[PDB]
Nucleic acid binder design. Structure first.
Lengths: 219, 219
RNA sequence: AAAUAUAUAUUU
RNA sequence: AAAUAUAUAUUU
RNA sequence: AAAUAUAUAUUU
RNA sequence: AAAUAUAUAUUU
C-alpha cells in the first residue's frame, strides 16, 4: 500500500494498518471507519504535546501571555503548517467535497491518535515522535509570538471580557518635526495607556494595541 | 512538612518538595510564585488524561456523544469532586480569602502538572498514577452524568443531536388484572425500535428509552 | 357494604 | 385537580 | 390530565 | 429572544 510513503515521513511504521487508514479516511469515503473518534482524542493529545512544549519554552511563563499564544498553536491554521511537512492531504481518503482547510487539520489530530493507539498508548513514545517532527517549528512560532488574529481584535475581546468595554483610540501625531509622514495614536483602556507609531493611522493602532496587550498580561 | 500527608494520599513522594507547594500556593498567599502556569500546563495535561479515558471507556464513541460527556468530565466542578477525595482544600494555602469552588480545580490542574514534571515528565507514569485513583469516578461520571438525566431525556438529546429530531413512543397494550395492569410501549426512531414494559406508561417508555439508547450506541 | 378525610398506584 | 383501586382513621 | 414555572436538548 | 419536546415542581 502507498501508506509507506507516509510512515517514512512520519517516522513510525504501523503494526495495524487499518488503524492508520482510518485516521486518513473520511466519512464521505467510508461512514464505517472514519477519523471522527481519533480526531476527538488527537485533539486532547496534540494539545497536551503543544501546551507542554509551550509552557516549557515560553519566554513569559504567564497564563495571561500563554492563552493567546496557544490559540495559534492549537489552531487549524498552524496544524496545516505542521501537517504540510507530511503532505497529509495526499494520503487523505475523502470523497464528498475536495480537501478542506479544516478537514486536514482534523485529520492531523486523528493521525497522532492512530500512532498513539498503535504504540500501546505509550504517551512518552508518541510525544517524542511528535517533537522530532515539529518541536522546532513550535519553538519558532513561540519565539516570534505568532498570534491568531490582529492585536486590535484580541485586545477588544479581552477588554469586553474583563470590562464589557472596548478600547479607546486617539490620534496624537500625524507628522514629524521636518514634515514627514508618520502616525502616532494612543491605544487606551481604563487608565492603562500606550503609544503606537505606523505608516498608517491603522498600522499605528495595531501597534498601540499590541502594546496594550502586554501592559495587561499581569494586570 | 504537612505535605507528607498529601503525598500519602497521592501515592507519590516529590523529589522537589517545592513543586507540590508551588502548585498549592494561591496568588493571594504569594503572588511571588503561585500555581498559575503550572495549572495552565495541567489544564492540557488533565484534559488529555480524561479525554483518553473517555474515548476508550465510552459506550458510544461518536463525537456528538463524547463532546457533552467530556464537557462535564473537565468542568471546574467535577475536579472538586475528585480533589476533595484528597482534601486538597486543607492542603492548599491562600492568604486573603477562602477556598473558592473553582479554585480547587485550578490548583488541581497544577497538582498533576507538578507530579508530571517532578516525575521527570513521564506522561505514561503521571497518567497511570492518575488512573490508580480517579478511574472509578471518571468511569462513573460517564454513566449517570452531572444531572443524571432520565432515559427518555437522554435519548431525545441523542436523536436531536445526530438527526435533529425526537423519537416516537406509542402504547401497544395492557396486561394483568384491572388494578395491577402492565403497559407495553414501543420506542422508535427512524428505522430502529425497542419494546418497554412497566406498571405505568412512562415507566414503560423509560425502559424502552434505555433500550433504544443501547441499540443506538451499538450502531 | 356506603361515605368523609388522608396516603399509595394507575388513568385523564 | 377528577376518576378508579387498595390501605388507615372516622361516620353510618 | 390542563395551565404555569424551572431545568436541559434541538430548531428559528 | 422565541418555538418544540423531555424531566420535575407548583396551582387547579
Amino acid at each position: 500500500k502507498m501508506l509507506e510513503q507516509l510512515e517514512k515521513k512520519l517516522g513510525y511504521t504501523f503494526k495495524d494498518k487499518s488503524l492508520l487508514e482510518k485516521a486518513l479516511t473520511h466519512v464521505s469515503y467510508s461512514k464505517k471507519e472514519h477519523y471522527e473518534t481519533l480526531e476527538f482524542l488527537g485533539d486532547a493529545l496534540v494539545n497536551f504535546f503543544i501546551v507542554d512544549l509551550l509552557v516549557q519554552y515560553s519566554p513569559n511563563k504567564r497564563e495571561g501571555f500563554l492563552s493567546p499564544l496557544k490559540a495559534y498553536l492549537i489552531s487549524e491554521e498552524f496544524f496545516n503548517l505542521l501537517a504540510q511537512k507530511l503532505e497529509l492531504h495526499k494520503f487523505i481518503r475523502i470523497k464528498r467535497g475536495k480537501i478542506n482547510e479544516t478537514i486536514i487539520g482534523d485529520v492531523f489530530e486523528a493521525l497522532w491518535a492512530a500512532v498513539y493507539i498503535d504504540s500501546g498508548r505509550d504517551a512518552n513514545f508518541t510525544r517524542e515522535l511528535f517533537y522530532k517532527l515539529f518541536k522546532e517549528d513550535i519553538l519558532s512560532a513561540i519565539k516570534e509570538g505568532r498570534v491568531k488574529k490582529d492585536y486590535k481584535t484580541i485586545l477588544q475581546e479581552i477588554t469586553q471580557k474583563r470590562w464589557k468595554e472596548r478600547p479607546e483610540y486617539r490620534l496624537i501625531s500625524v507628522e514629524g518635526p521636518h514634515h514627514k509622514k508618520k502616525f502616532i495614536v494612543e491605544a487606551k483602556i481604563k487608565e492603562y495607556r500606550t503609544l503606537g507609531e505606523g505608516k498608517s493611522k491603522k498600522e499605528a493602532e495595531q501597534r498601540a494595541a499590541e502594546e496594550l496587550i502586554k501592559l495587561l498580561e499581569e494586570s
